[PDB]
Amino acid sequence: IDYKFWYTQPVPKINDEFNESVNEPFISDNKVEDVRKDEYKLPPGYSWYVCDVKDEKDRSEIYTLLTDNYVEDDDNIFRFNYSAEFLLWALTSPNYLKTWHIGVKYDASNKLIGFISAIPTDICIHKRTIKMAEVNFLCVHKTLRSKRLAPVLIKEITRRINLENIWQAIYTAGVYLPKPVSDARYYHRSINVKKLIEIGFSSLNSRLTMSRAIKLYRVEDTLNIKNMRLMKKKDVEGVHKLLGSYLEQFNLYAVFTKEEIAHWFLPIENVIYTYVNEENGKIKDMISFYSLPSQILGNDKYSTLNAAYSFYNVTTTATFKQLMQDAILLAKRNNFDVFNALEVMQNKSVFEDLKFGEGDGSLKYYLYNWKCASFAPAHVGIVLL
Ligand SMILES: CCCCCCCCCCCCCC(=O)CSCCNC(=O)CCNC(=O)[C@H](O)C(C)(C)COP(=O)(O)OP(=O)(O)OC[C@H]1O[C@@H](n2cnc3c(N)ncnc32)[C@H](O)[C@@H]1OP(=O)(O)O
Ligand SMILES: Cc1cc(F)ccc1-c1ccc2[nH]nc(CN(C)C)c2c1
Numbered sequence: 195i196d197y198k199f200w201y202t203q204p205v206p207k208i209n210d211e212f213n214e215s216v217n218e219p220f221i222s223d224n225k226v227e228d229v230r231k232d233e234y235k236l237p238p239g240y241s242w243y244v245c246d247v248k249d250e251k252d253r254s255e256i257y258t259l260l261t262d263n264y265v266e267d268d269d270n271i272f273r274f275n276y277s278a279e280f281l282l283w284a285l286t287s288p289n290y291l292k293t294w295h296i297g298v299k300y301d302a303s304n305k306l307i308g309f310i311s312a313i314p315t316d317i318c319i320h321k322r323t324i325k326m327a328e329v330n331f332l333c334v335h336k337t338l339r340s341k342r343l344a345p346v347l348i349k350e351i352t353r354r355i356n357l358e359n360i361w362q363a364i365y366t367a368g369v370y371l372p373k374p375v376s377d378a379r380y381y382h383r384s385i386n387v388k389k390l391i392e393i394g395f396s397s398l399n400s401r402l403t404m405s406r407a408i409k410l411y412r413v414e415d416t417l418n419i420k421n422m423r424l425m426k427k428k429d430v431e432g433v434h435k436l437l438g439s440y441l442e443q444f445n446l447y448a449v450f451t452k453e454e455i456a457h458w459f460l461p462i463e464n465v466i467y468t469y470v471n472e473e474n475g476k477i478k479d480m481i482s483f484y485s486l487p488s489q490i491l492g493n494d495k496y497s498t499l500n501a502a503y504s505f506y507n508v509t510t511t512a513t514f515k516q517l518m519q520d521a522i523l524l525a526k527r528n529n530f531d532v533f534n535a536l537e538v539m540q541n542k543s544v545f546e547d548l549k550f551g552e553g554d555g556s557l558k559y560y561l562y563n564w565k566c567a568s569f570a571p572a573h574v575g576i577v578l579l
């Protein structure tokens with residue numbers, strides 16, 4: 195297609211290909227003093243709104259907008275239903291700015307109809323660490339689609355990020371845009387087989403009857419790593435060294451400070467689950483997965499698919515297969531129906547043996563204002579929510 199908005203932006207054109215000797219901005223020597231001070235103009239009757247995600251009621255508003263209008267699969271069966279507490283965690287990480295949590299209201303009803311957000315993160319791309327904004331939760335109400343609101347939201351957050359002297363961004367989407375640095379398919383491991391069959395997500399056939407499908411996905415309720423336990427505050431330093439070390443191998447990863455490790459990993463029920471194996475007061479292995487339910491549209495029996503999404507997993511005392519087998523069992527113990535992972539890091543290597551199935555699409559990783567070589571998803575070492 196044309197990408198008439200995206201081609202005005204500092205991102206690669208559809209045919210751009212850079213070798214590994216190239217790792218730099220499209221536009222360098224930017225000047226904070228030159229950034230527009232005026233808000234981008236919205237159509238008549240709509241206004242910017244600065245959301246306070248720590249206020250329950252403003253946070254409820256964002257929650258309702260996403261619950262009704264956020265991402266669906268291509269068949270419009272499932273819609274992501276991030277919980278309000280999950281949105282609080284995702285948006286209030288260390289050094290967050292309230293002014294990068296941007297809503298648009300329709301003045302006559304006072305209702306929120308659009309949203310976009312960013313948080314700051316140090317991102318290492320091909321061994322250069324850059325202060326960036328991670329952009330997420332871009333949403334326009336279903337009644338106002340294809341009216342070119344989204345570029346307004348994007349330009350307005352880019353302006354507010356640039357005020358902080360930040361000139362690069364990282365973002366992910368299932369849709370193809372100019373132009374991915376990497377592309378990772380997702381895979382799903384069934385936990386509650388029967389439920390997934392009954393809502394249409396998984397299938398039977400003359401060979402695979404219901405009883406046989408259930409048996410296929412049965413797991414033993416005993417951990418490979420016996421001492422794996424919920425992460426506690428005392429474990430923050432050990433997680434930071436274990437994970438920090440591990441992530442240096444990849445082409446793309448966040449550089450976490452200790453404060454970021456406590457925020458992104460300390461457990462919160464129905465939001466983030468992290469488990470650790472401690473030997474001698476050292477953290478030797480970790481598992482983590484976050485909770486992202488999908489609302490089920492038009493199923494008479496079920497309204498919610500409870501799904502655990504693999505986050506960061508590191509083993510030094512087991513095989514990666516054994517670690518991920520434990521991650522599936524811990525998701526099962528926590529009532530999840532399915533365990534979802536992308537082919538990033540070492541994940542793809544355990545998919546066949548641990549009975550994952552290939553999904554319907556892929557997640558694309560993108561950088562704004564950064565020119566570099568693209569790479570296979572095994573070299574991606576970051577997971578965005
Ligand atoms: C230095 C700092 C830099 C900061 C900024 C970094 C960049 C951040 C970029 C954002 C990253 C967010 C990451 C993220 O949140 C995670 S990906 C999830 C995005 N959210 C949804 O999918 C929710 C359901 N859909 C919608 O709400 C609407 O369809 C949205 C709002 C998606 C588009 O609204 P619409 O009513 O359907 O469409 P128009 O207003 O008419 O706009 C059409 C223009 O929007 C382009 N478009 C469509 N989807 C996009 C997507 N997912 N990223 C970027 N661009 C997207 C499209 O290519 C077109 O441009 P083109 O004509 O050139 O092709
Ligand atoms: C289905 C799935 C499975 C999986 F294991 C990992 C990711 C996805 C998925 C696909 C499309 C998406 N669009 N936006 C999001 C939310 N963020 C990542 C921004 C998103 C996530």
Ligand SMILES: [Cl-]
Binds near residue numbers: 349
């Ligand atoms: Cl403009």
Ligand SMILES: [Mg+2]
Binds near residue numbers: 334340341342344
């Ligand atoms: Mg629109």
